[PDB]
Amino acid sequence: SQPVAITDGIYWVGAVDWNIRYFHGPAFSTHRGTTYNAYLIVDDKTALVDTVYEPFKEELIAKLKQIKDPVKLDYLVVNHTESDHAGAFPAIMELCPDAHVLCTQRAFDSLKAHYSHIDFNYTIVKTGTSVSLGKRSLTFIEAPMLHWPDSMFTYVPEEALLLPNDAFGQHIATSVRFDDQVDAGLIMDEAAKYYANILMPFSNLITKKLDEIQKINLAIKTIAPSHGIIWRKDPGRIIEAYARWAEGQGKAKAVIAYDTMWLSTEKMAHALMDGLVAGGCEVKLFKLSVSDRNDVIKEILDARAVLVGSPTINNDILPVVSPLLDDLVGLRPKNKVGLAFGAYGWGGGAQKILEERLKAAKIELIAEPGPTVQWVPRGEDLQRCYELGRKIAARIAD
C-alpha cells in the first residue's frame, strides 16, 4: 500500500501480486507470485517509469497519491508495452491527459494498437536521447528483442540507477523490496528461472548489450527491474550472472527429461544417468508428467547436455514430452549436446520425432540413432546406455 523510497525523490510505486501462479497465460509458472514494478522520479518535472498490470491500477494510483495528491506526472516512460507493464496506461493517461509519453518507435506502434482511442503527447526516443527533469535527467538505451521489439532501458545518470524493465528481474512476491533483504541463493535461483524461460533465446543479444554498456562505461549503482527485487546492494552479481548465462559455457551438468508407461524408458534413463555420474557429471533427472516444465528449463540453462526420452504410442511420442520439446525449439538453447532415447513395441516412431525436434532446437546429437529398446531392456542394452552416458560425460568434460 505504501510507496517505497529507493532514494530521495525516487520511489517504487508498483504492486505486489501474491496469488498469481501462472504468467503469460500457461507459459510461466510463478510458485511464489510476482510483482509489477513501476518507478516515480520526482523533480522540477516528475516522471513515472512504466505502469502496472491493469488489475492493480488502483494500487499504482493510490501509491502515486501518497507522494503528491493531484498526481502531477509530466513524463510517462514506457520501456515495454507488454501488458503487465502497460495495462494501467489508460487509467494513468485519464488521470493526467497532459502527461508526455517517452518511448521507442515499436513501442509507440504497439501502444496505438493495444489502446487506440487514447490520444497523447509523445516523443520517440532512441539510444542516447536524454530528457531533463531538473536536478536529474533520464537517458535511454534501446534494447530491441531484449524480450520485445519495443524494449528499452531507462538510465538516471545523477543516481547511476538503471531501470531495465524485464531484464534482471525475477518473478517473486515479497513485502521486502531489496536484494539485501532476501536470501542471496534463493533470489539468484529465481533470477535464473526467469532468464532461462524468457531470455535464453536472446543470449547473443544479451552479451552485445552488456558490452555496449561496458564500453560506454555506464556506472550502475542500482538496478530496478519491472519484476521482483531491486538490486541495490550488489548489481554486479546479477550482471556477471547474465554474462555467464548468455556466454553459454555451461557447467559439467546434464539434464535428463523423460516419461514412460511401463518403466523401460525409465530404466534406460537410469542407466544413462549412472554413466553420466560415473563420468564425473552432475545429473538432474525429471519425470515430465510430475515435474514443472519451467523448473526443467531452468536446469538446462547451466547444463551442457540434454537427454530426452520417451516410448512410442500410436507411432508418436508421449504427449507429456511435447511441451518440453516445442519449448526448447523456441528457446534455442545455446551450445548444448543431446541425446534421444526410448522403448517401443513393434514399429517405433518416437525416436525420429525426438531427434527431429532436438535438432530443430539446435542441440547437437551425441548420436544419430540414439538408444532404443524393444519391449524391455536386457543386460547389454542398459550397458550400452551406461557407456553412452559415460561418453556424453567425457565430452561435457570440463
Q: How many residues does the chain have?
A: 398
Q: Under a CB-based contact definition with an 8 Å cutoff, are residues 280 and 320 in contact? A: no
Task: Verify binding: residue 180, a copy of itself, rule CB under 8 A.
Answer: no
Contact (CB, 8 A) for 64 and 49: no
Q: Please indicate whether residue 24 is annotated as part of the active site.
A: yes
Is residue 116 within the footprint of Zn ion (CB under 5 A)? no
Question: 85, 171, 227, 270: which one is catalytic?
Answer: 227
Taking CB under 8 A as the criterion, the residue among 325, 343, 382, 396 binding a copy of itself is 325
Map residue 320 onto helix, strand or coil: helix
Choose the contact partner of 119 out of Zn ion, ligand FMN, a copy of itself, none; CB within 5 to 8 A by kind. Answer: Zn ion
Is 259 an interacting residue with respect to a copy of itself (CB under 8 A)?
Answer: yes
Marked catalytic residue, from 11, 142, 147, 259: 147
User: Residue 398, Cβ neighbours under 10 Å: how many?
Assistant: 11
Angle between helices 235-247 and 184-194 (to 10 degrees): 40
Which spans in 162-234 are helix H? 184-194, 203-215
Site for Zn ion, residues 53 to 72, rule: CB under 5 A:
55
* Residue 221 contacts residue 159 (beta carbons within 8 Å): yes
Spatial neighbors of 262 by CB under 8 A, at least 6 apart, are 311, 343
CB of 121 to ligand FMN, least distance (A): 26
The single residue among 189, 234, 282, 316 that binds a copy of itself, judged by CB under 8 A, is: 316
* For ligand FMN, the closer CB: 231 or 344: 344
- Cα separation of 86 and 81, whole Å? 5
Q: How far is the CB of 183 from ligand FMN (least distance, A)?
A: 27
CB of 200 to Zn ion, least distance (A): 31
Report residue 38 CA to chain centroid gap: 19
Q: In angstroms, what is the minimal distance from the CB of 352 to ligand FMN?
A: 12
380 is annotated as contributing to ligand binding:
no
Cα angle, residue 80 at apex, residues 190 and 64 outer, rounded to 5°: 85
Q: Are 339 and 365 in contact (CB under 8 A)?
A: yes
Best CA proximity match to 182, nearest among 236, 233, 237: 233
| Residue 117, contacted partner among Zn ion, a copy of itself, ligand FMN, none, CB below 5-8 A by kind | Zn ion
119 in contact with Zn ion (CB under 5 A): yes
| 49 closest CA partner among 110, 108, 92, 1 | 92
Can 166 be counted among the known catalytic residues?
yes
Q: Which is nearer to Zn ion, 1 or 314 (CB)?
A: 1
Residues of span 159-188 touching Zn ion by CB under 5 A: none
- With contacts defined by CB under 8 A, name the span among 155-163, 169-177, 188-196, 328-336 that binds a copy of itself: 328-336
Among 1, 8, 69, 113, binds a copy of itself (CB under 8 A): 113
Selected catalytic residue, list 11, 75, 194, 195: 194
Three-state SS string over 102-131 comes to EECHHHHHHHHHHCCCCCCEEEECCCCCEE
Reduced to 3 states, what is the DSSP secondary structure of residue 276?
Answer: helix
How far is residue 339's CA from residue 341's CA, in Å, rounded to a whole number?
A: 7
Looking at the Cβ atoms of 54 and 316, the one nearer to Zn ion is: 54
Question: Residue 268 CB, nearest distance to ligand FMN (Å)?
Answer: 7
- Known active-site residue 270: no
- For the chain, the distance separating the N- and C-terminal CA atoms, rounded to the nearest angstrom, is 49
Three cell numbers, residue 57 = 491500477
- Contact positions vs Zn ion (CB under 5 A): 1, 55, 117, 119, 274
- Residue numbers belonging to the annotated binding site for Fe cation: 80, 82, 84, 147, 166, 227
Active site residues: 24, 80, 82, 84, 147, 166, 194, 227
- Contact positions vs a copy of itself (CB under 8 A): 22, 24-27, 83, 110, 113-114, 148-149, 201, 259-262, 288-289, 293, 311, 313-320, 322-327, 329-332, 345-346, 353, 374-376
